[PDB]
Symmetry: D2
Subunit: 121 residues, 4 copies
């Protein structure tokens, strides 16, 4: 398994040791509090009231946890994924990223703690 943190201010995102291969089943659990700028903080599902001004993932809220698998588009993680199979034909290293608008990470704060494991299959 992999265990680490994802900083809200990291535009590049946090590379993990997990390589998603075809047929893999994985479980992700994410926790913690972070901000895209404001004083308030939000958990891994982010801020359901904030408008999307060009987020790196249009299928999750501003301040939510998202990922890429290899060269893929952004995929919502939020609080996690239970015994999940990639619905698309994606393969490769998982990178975790805080959902914010490109070029606006500098004022972000906080972090999520994240576990990723492969399940039986």
């Amino acid at each position: 398994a992999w265990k680490g943190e994802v900083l809200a201010n990291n535009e590049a995102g946090q590379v993990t040791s997990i390589i998603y291969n075809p047929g893999d089943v994985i479980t992700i659990v994410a926790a913690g509090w972070a901000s895209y700028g404001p004083t308030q903080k939000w958990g891994p599902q982010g801020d359901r009231e904030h408008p999307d001004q060009g987020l790196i993932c249009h299928d999750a809220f501003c301040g939510a946890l998202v990922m890429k698998i290899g060269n893929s588009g952004t995929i919502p993680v939020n609080t996690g994924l239970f015994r999940w199979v990639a619905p698309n034909n994606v393969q490769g290293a998982i990178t975790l990223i805080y959902n914010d608008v490109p070029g606006t990470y500098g004022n972000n704060s906080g972090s999520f703690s994240v576990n990723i494991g492969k399940d039986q299959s």
Copy 2:
């Protein structure tokens, strides 16, 4: 494994099909949006700004997900637990409960979608 909804207004809580036995390793993933009364909604970590006015779980925020195992006291769940082993001598049915003040659940709204599975041991 078990998958189901934990209603915010369900004061008795949601009994699951999971019996926790000594040595069991479990994973929980919880998602969704709910309120203890206000117009706003919060995830399974609840509302970090809201004071404790007599919650069923003093170790989690108002609006968070908690559980009991058989006749245990409440245990925080929040977004979930990854390959978790019970610290205390506990056993029996896992029940999932929305964290609010007893007798104040009537004005609650939303639900959390929750998966629980036993892991390889």
Copy 3:
């Protein structure tokens, strides 16, 4: 999980650390060479040519690996069981035993090396 040795000359068999609980899924893998008396040796499936002269398990060959779960009768194991669920209402410690005729274990030799794990459920 549990790992250990099942000696062919141990009429009581080997009590393992595994407590089989309702709903568990288990995997057993057994390996090695053992004898019920002759200079020849046989693997965990035993000797398919040998008549049953009062074996502890009538559903496996003489020299096979078998088990008991709590107060059950003998259940054939042979080379192992893959993601296996016990009959309804069978529960308790798993005991591994070499299949021979009671009172005839003293001339036995060799052992099976066995792994038992709980699988995801």
Copy 4:
């Protein structure tokens, strides 16, 4: 997971659905009775008394279960593998094969029933 039969008389072997990838933990359970020619039959550990006359796998007995992983050389399976990882730089499709001398498969009979699963990591 994969489940299927490996015939003793199939020189090329049984190609499975399992692609072994770097990091994968696998379990195999093999069972059954087969012959390399004589009237006797042996399980997946094969015949410990038969000399090696140019077997496809010098590390296992004649009549044992063996495998190839992608372009690897033969690797013993015998009764199976419990939560096993392959050597570095061994990867690809698993093919299961009865251990005999090339060109001598036609007088073989019987089959092994095999299960292969990927385990939690």
